[PDB]
Amino acid sequence: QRSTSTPNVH
Amino acid sequence: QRSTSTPNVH
Amino acid sequence: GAMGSMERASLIQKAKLAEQAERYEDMAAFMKGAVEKGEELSCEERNLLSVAYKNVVGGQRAAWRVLSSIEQKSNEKGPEVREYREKVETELQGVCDTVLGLLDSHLIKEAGDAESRVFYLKMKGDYYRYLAEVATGDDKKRIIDSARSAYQEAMDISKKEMPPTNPIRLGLALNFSVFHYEIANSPEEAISLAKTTFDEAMADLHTLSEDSYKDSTLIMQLLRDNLTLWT
Amino acid sequence: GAMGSMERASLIQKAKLAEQAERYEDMAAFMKGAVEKGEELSCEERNLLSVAYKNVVGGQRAAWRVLSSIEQKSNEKGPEVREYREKVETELQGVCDTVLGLLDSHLIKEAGDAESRVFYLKMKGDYYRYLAEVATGDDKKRIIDSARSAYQEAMDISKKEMPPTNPIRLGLALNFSVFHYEIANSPEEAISLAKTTFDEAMADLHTLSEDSYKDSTLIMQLLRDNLTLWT
Ligand SMILES: *CC(=O)N1CC2(C1)CN(S(=O)(=O)c1ccc(Br)cc1)CCO2
Ligand SMILES: *CC(=O)N1CC2(C1)CN(S(=O)(=O)c1ccc(Br)cc1)CCO2
Ligand SMILES: [Cl-]
Ligand SMILES: [Cl-]
Ligand SMILES: [Mg+2]
Ligand SMILES: [Mg+2]
Ligand SMILES: [Mg+2]
Ligand SMILES: [Mg+2]
Structure with missing residues (x-):
């Protein structure tokens, strides 16, 4: 399980 | 709602 | 290439x-x-x-x-x-x-498996059908007839050479009935084809093949879904 | 073009x-x-x-x-x-x-919004980081330093010019901490950055903006998730 980066939105 | 055709599989 | x-x-x-x-x-x-x-x-x-x-x-x-x-x-x-x-x-x-x-x-060839011949003619009907979804003019008539002709030739072979549960035969009939309902503006043809296909697979259910029965039963469920939508 | x-x-x-x-x-x-x-x-x-x-x-x-x-x-x-x-x-x-x-x-320019300057420098750090995920040789060192330098310059501006709940500031710090953990092999730097960012957003929670608070609270939850993974 990798780290979570900023997701897409809007 | 459209008709359903053959799906992808395998 | x-x-x-x-x-x-x-x-x-x-x-x-x-x-x-x-x-x-x-x-x-x-x-x-x-x-x-x-x-x-x-x-x-x-x-x-x-x-x-x-x-x-x-x-x-x-x-x-x-x-x-x-x-x-x-x-x-x-x-x-x-x-x-x-x-x-x-x-x-x-x-x-x-x-x-x-x-x-x-x-597309004269020789080979029923499976291969039916599958490719089914493919041809499908991609003509996708062209027909976006066609309008003199092209649209040419394309719709091309789809029907390829589907019909695939249907003829599948009915002669294939058990009624064969998944390629089923998927072909499913896609042809979708053609009838969505493209050719022939609803009654689509229900009757879909119902005949489902009922005939069901009547000879014992012909399910052990390497493909999951595919067969999926398509017969999709036939039922379309029939429920169309009725 | x-x-x-x-x-x-x-x-x-x-x-x-x-x-x-x-x-x-x-x-x-x-x-x-x-x-x-x-x-x-x-x-x-x-x-x-x-x-x-x-x-x-x-x-x-x-x-x-x-x-x-x-x-x-x-x-x-x-x-x-x-x-x-x-x-x-x-x-x-x-x-x-x-x-x-x-x-x-x-x-990337000297002029303009803090928002724009931070966002583009964040972008530069991210795409260097994506290059670093697949790099190996002499390139890999060059690329990793380029990512860090862009992230660090974005961090400096965001800390001076932006409230600690600003979603660009938060997303930057989230991505920089991911850089530390996954790319630079500096775990402790990543937990400490992620914890400092979460805690400082939480201490000044009243600075949430009514046109972006949903974005802010999403990133602080993602900071918490990474901290839970890393601890
Ligand atoms: C064995 C063979 O020729 N084929 C082609 C296929 C396996 C089946 N076709 S299909 O469009 O006939 C099809 C049937 C049933 C399902 Br659930 C899905 C697709 C697709 C390609 O693979
Ligand atoms: C206003 C402005 O410059 N931007 C760019 C953004 C809106 C935000 N960024 S981001 O990568 O900073 C980001 C922050 C928070 C979330 Br939940 C997602 C992304 C992405 C592009 O739009
Ligand atoms: Cl290749
Ligand atoms: Cl265009
Ligand atoms: Mg060869
Ligand atoms: Mg056109
Ligand atoms: Mg112009
Ligand atoms: Mg390479």
Whole structure:
């Protein structure tokens, strides 16, 4: 399980 | 709602 | 073409890797290169070809439908929606033309398995049907008849050569009934074909094959779903 | 380029249509053409640019990871897995090079909003980080330092010019901490940055903005998730 980066939105 | 055709599989 | 220097077996291998990686444009290019080697495709390889191009054209149809719906609601102010819909439409037509050219140049033959002959004629009917979803003018009539002719020839073979539970026969009849309902404006033909196909598979249910019965029963459920939608 | 004859406003409009149609390669091409008009991008337009290229490169990273894992398990027999991994890798690098060239040639400036300056330097750190995920040799050191330098410059500005709940500041710190943990092999730096960022947003929670608070609270939850993973 990798780290979570900023997701897409809007 | 459209008709359903053959799906992808395998 | 771009795939001409690669060995057939490497192209198949890479099509399988591209499927795993969900790179369907790559996987279609690899399978097009495999087809262009001029040998027949096995069932497993026909599945690879089918999955790749269906994924590619499916994304194009989905995009085209979004844009077309926006275009229709804006007709109730600039050229941009139409131009971009025309762009996606042209790309979709190009993929259908590519598939149909492969079928005509390489894959559709008099010899071979019933499975192969029915599957490729089914494919031809499908990609003509996708062209017909976006056609309008004198082209549209030409395309609709081409789809019907390919479906009907596939139906004739499947009914003579294939058990009524065979998944290619079932998927063909499912797609032909969708053609009748959505393209040819012949609802009654679509219910009657779908009902006849379901009932005949059910009457000879004992002909399910142990290597494909899950595929058969999936398509008979989809026949039932369409019948429920249409009734 | 290919977009040079289209009006800026039409390019923006078409980028929005392409987003709706989930045609992210198109939408990135449209936004690249918009950037090349040489005017600044608004917040809404930076979001379009960001969404397009992140979707494109995200699919490439996902594919590259699948192939790389297959390649590593097969190293425990032909060249095909490596060649196809190299193919996807080259395409990914090309997209990162395209984004970084746009940042350097058009978007990164001394003037403008803190928002814009931080966002573009964050972008530069991210796409160097994506290059670093697939780099190996003398390039890899050059790329890792380039990512850090861009992140650090963005951090300096965001801490001076932005409230600690600002979503660009938060997303930057989240991505920098991911850089520390996954790329730079500095776990402790990543927990400490992520914890400092979360705690400082929480201490000044009253600075949440009513047009972006949902974005802020999403990133602080993602900071917490990473901290839970890393501890
Ligand atoms: C063995 C063979 O020729 N093929 C081609 C197929 C396996 C089946 N077709 S299909 O379109 O006939 C189909 C039937 C049933 C289902 Br659930 C899905 C698709 C697709 C390619 O693979
Ligand atoms: C106003 C402005 O410049 N922008 C760019 C953004 C809106 C935000 N960024 S981001 O990467 O900073 C980001 C922050 C928070 C979330 Br939940 C997601 C992304 C992305 C593009 O739009
Ligand atoms: Cl266009
Ligand atoms: Cl390759
Ligand atoms: Mg060969
Ligand atoms: Mg047309
Ligand atoms: Mg202009
Ligand atoms: Mg390399």
